[PDB]
Design an enzyme around this catalytic site. Sequence first.
Site, PDB file in Angstrom:
ATOM      1  N   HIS A  41       0.853  -1.462  -0.306  1.00 28.46           N
ATOM      2  CA  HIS A  41       0.199  -0.456   0.186  1.00 28.46           C
ATOM      3  C   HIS A  41       1.053   1.564   0.073  1.00 28.46           C
ATOM      4  O   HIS A  41      -0.046   1.994  -0.097  1.00 28.46           O
ATOM      5  CB  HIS A  41      -1.427   0.469   1.374  1.00 28.46           C
ATOM      6  N   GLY A 134       2.183   6.200  10.305  1.00 30.49           N
ATOM      7  CA  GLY A 134       4.056   5.979  10.418  1.00 30.49           C
ATOM      8  C   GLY A 134       4.878   4.443  10.506  1.00 30.49           C
ATOM      9  O   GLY A 134       5.658   4.493  10.539  1.00 30.49           O
ATOM     10  N   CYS A 136       3.098   1.399  10.268  1.00 33.48           N
ATOM     11  CA  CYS A 136       2.918   0.732   8.919  1.00 33.48           C
ATOM     12  C   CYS A 136       4.380   0.269   8.294  1.00 33.48           C
ATOM     13  O   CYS A 136       5.620   0.650   8.136  1.00 33.48           O
ATOM     14  CB  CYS A 136       2.203   1.425   7.625  1.00 33.48           C
TER      15      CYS A 136
HETATM   16  C1  LIG Z   1      -7.402   3.876  11.162  1.00 35.16           C
HETATM   17  N1  LIG Z   1      -6.972   4.043   9.993  1.00 35.16           N
HETATM   18  C2  LIG Z   1      -7.150   5.204   9.257  1.00 35.16           C
HETATM   19  O1  LIG Z   1      -8.759   5.565   8.812  1.00 35.16           O
HETATM   20  C3  LIG Z   1      -6.476   5.186   7.298  1.00 35.16           C
HETATM   21  N2  LIG Z   1      -5.865   4.187   7.180  1.00 35.16           N
HETATM   22  C4  LIG Z   1      -6.532   3.377   6.029  1.00 35.16           C
HETATM   23  C5  LIG Z   1      -5.850   2.402   5.522  1.00 35.16           C
HETATM   24  C6  LIG Z   1      -6.445   1.144   4.833  1.00 35.16           C
HETATM   25  C7  LIG Z   1      -5.391  -0.053   4.386  1.00 35.16           C
HETATM   26  C8  LIG Z   1      -4.587  -0.112   4.690  1.00 35.16           C
HETATM   27 CL1  LIG Z   1      -3.264  -1.694   4.548  1.00 35.16          CL
HETATM   28  C9  LIG Z   1      -4.304   0.879   5.584  1.00 35.16           C
HETATM   29  C10 LIG Z   1      -4.653   1.876   6.092  1.00 35.16           C
HETATM   30  C11 LIG Z   1      -3.709   3.551   6.753  1.00 35.16           C
HETATM   31  C12 LIG Z   1      -3.440   2.874   8.282  1.00 35.16           C
HETATM   32  O2  LIG Z   1      -4.359   1.691   8.488  1.00 35.16           O
HETATM   33  N3  LIG Z   1      -2.780   3.137   8.972  1.00 35.16           N
HETATM   34  C13 LIG Z   1      -2.684   3.313  10.244  1.00 35.16           C
HETATM   35  C14 LIG Z   1      -1.562   1.636  10.387  1.00 35.16           C
HETATM   36  N4  LIG Z   1      -1.090   1.369  12.142  1.00 35.16           N
HETATM   37  C15 LIG Z   1      -1.686   2.616  13.169  1.00 35.16           C
HETATM   38  C16 LIG Z   1      -2.361   3.806  12.714  1.00 35.16           C
HETATM   39  C17 LIG Z   1      -3.264   4.492  13.520  1.00 35.16           C
HETATM   40  C18 LIG Z   1      -3.306   6.205  12.484  1.00 35.16           C
HETATM   41  F1  LIG Z   1      -3.942   6.287  14.078  1.00 35.16           F
HETATM   42  C19 LIG Z   1      -3.717   6.242  12.149  1.00 35.16           C
HETATM   43  C20 LIG Z   1      -3.451   5.188  11.326  1.00 35.16           C
HETATM   44  C21 LIG Z   1      -3.284   3.927  11.349  1.00 35.16           C
HETATM   45  C22 LIG Z   1      -4.317   4.158   6.941  1.00 35.16           C
END
Ligand SMILES: CNC(=O)CN1Cc2ccc(Cl)cc2[C@H](C(=O)Nc2cncc3cc(F)ccc23)C1
EC number: 3.4.19.12
Lengths: 296, 305
Positions: A41, A134, A136
Amino acid sequence: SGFRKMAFPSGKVEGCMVQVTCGTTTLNGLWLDDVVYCPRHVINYEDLLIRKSNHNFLVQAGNVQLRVIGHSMQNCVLKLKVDTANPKTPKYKFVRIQPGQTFSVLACYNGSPSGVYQCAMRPNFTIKGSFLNGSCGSVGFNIDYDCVSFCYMHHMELPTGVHAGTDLEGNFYGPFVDRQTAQAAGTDTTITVNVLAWLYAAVINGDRWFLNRFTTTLNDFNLVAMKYNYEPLTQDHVDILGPLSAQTGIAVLDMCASLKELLQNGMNGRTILGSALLEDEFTPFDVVRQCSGVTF
Amino acid sequence: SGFRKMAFPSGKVEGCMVQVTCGTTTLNGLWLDDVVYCPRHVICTSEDMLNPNYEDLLIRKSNHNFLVQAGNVQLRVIGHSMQNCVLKLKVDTANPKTPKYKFVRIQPGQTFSVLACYNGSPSGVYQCAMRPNFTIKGSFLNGSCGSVGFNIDYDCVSFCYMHHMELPTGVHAGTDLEGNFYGPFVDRQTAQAAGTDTTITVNVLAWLYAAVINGDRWFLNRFTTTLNDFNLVAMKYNYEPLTQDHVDILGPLSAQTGIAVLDMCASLKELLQNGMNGRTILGSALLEDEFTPFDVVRQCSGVTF
Ligand SMILES: CNC(=O)CN1Cc2ccc(Cl)cc2[C@H](C(=O)Nc2cncc3cc(F)ccc23)C1
Ligand SMILES: CNC(=O)CN1Cc2ccc(Cl)cc2[C@H](C(=O)Nc2cncc3cc(F)ccc23)C1
Ligand SMILES: [Cl-]
């Protein structure tokens, strides 16, 4: 004496963390030999990847920029061929773990490791991690002597605050997909074999108030486990608990009758190893290792 | 999202761990530049521990009596000296893996990471706090002596603890890297017992602010408290007195969540009175006191949920 949630020493993994940037997205990568592994991604993934060239991926290892000389996709992981092999590459394997198994997570941001914590693959295939935007590309691992077994790469956070990711071959743990859509963690359960292992650790550390004169059968106990949202205990789990049972002199079905009484009556204002809840993120092997002194 | 007990990455410390042997005793040492730091009780037998005279035991030793091992390589000891309860062994080789470092003495309530080692080999890493009674609730077995506690804020490692002993209650005692013990303890096997422990109030408040940041407010109430009234109630539950310093330190978290420190103190007062009523805060049924205000700011997001 003492019982802590203990992670493996992270040094062998710190030397593999890099920063991967593609356009506006910046996340973490795992540099092993001449390949950098990161969530796909960062970029219809085949159609989005076909438009990219090697120079579109910016890889940074400390203050040094690595040159990408090739790229390919394996399931949900992007594999970036780089011009330089990592001189800090440890002895390693890619392993897929089962729910109930525990591992260490080295949380990273911008290719820089910020923390290490221990966690378990929940029965619902999510992990209760501590990750921000960040993170990921942060990885989960275990150490077997000198060999690092990479078992997890962080991809996303679910709406309940729990985390989802893949093995290092790009296959997700759980019915999750790498995209923005309605996704939710299934109803979770408690890892029964792990709670028993932790009760054995408490007995080894001199906490025996929960022990009783009673025993039970696998059939009778599993009816109780099903009632309290506990995972079914199998004969394999009983066999795995053998060494701890012999060390403390308490039969596994004997310890099951203690867990049954804790489930039906609670703790009555008491704690076990400094906890008012029954801990399920220590495996039988974690207990044996922490109460023996295995080094890496 | 999420809140875990998080340790610092241990790699910078793993590259400093060595094994120190003197006769029959084998423990861990910290190799920084051309010096190996280890507990002075490595020169003792079990009999010596009752009333050891370290100056008399050390004068009978030569450099070649100390065997230092770094991985599979034997280091040569070229000098030795004692600084309080630490033995400093001058070696013939500087550690090429020496990180940027400082020796810092911490105060009770402060947290740090521990890299537990046996035979100069790191086995695990965990996070812990210096209790108000100057002990640490660690996880150590025989051979762990010389294991170190540290913080790595930015790129510099601040060494704050070296493990020396286990008290009869199962808790641990040790020194700063200058050999000065934390607590009224001695590296002698005498009647030694940890004082009555208390809960680190400023840390419990910090952790309640972390729960608010992550989205939980069930424990808040419409009340406030004076600082003195809060302390009169908190002392009854074995909580450490909260000082104006603690209130000042909680300022940034108070401004980020919009909840005044004395209003958060009122929620803590109520929590102590009523218990949790089957509820949890950040996955815990007990009030956590091993996360400092600094740890919460470091781990948590800057945007409150
Ligand atoms: C809750 N996240 C969102 O609304 C946006 N997301 C959409 C999305 C969709 C598919 C995939 Cl594979 C990755 C993502 C992104 C995602 O999951 N990244 C994050 C990972 N770990 C902690 C994360 C804490 C956070 F505070 C934010 C973002 C994190 C970004
Ligand atoms: C519980 N202690 C003993 O039976 C013997 N001890 C007596 C003693 C006295 C003073 C000093 Cl400075 C050091 C020691 C030694 C000592 O405390 N080392 C250990 C350290 N940490 C965890 C330890 C768990 C253990 F199970 C054993 C030994 C540990 C050795
Ligand atoms: Cl401090």
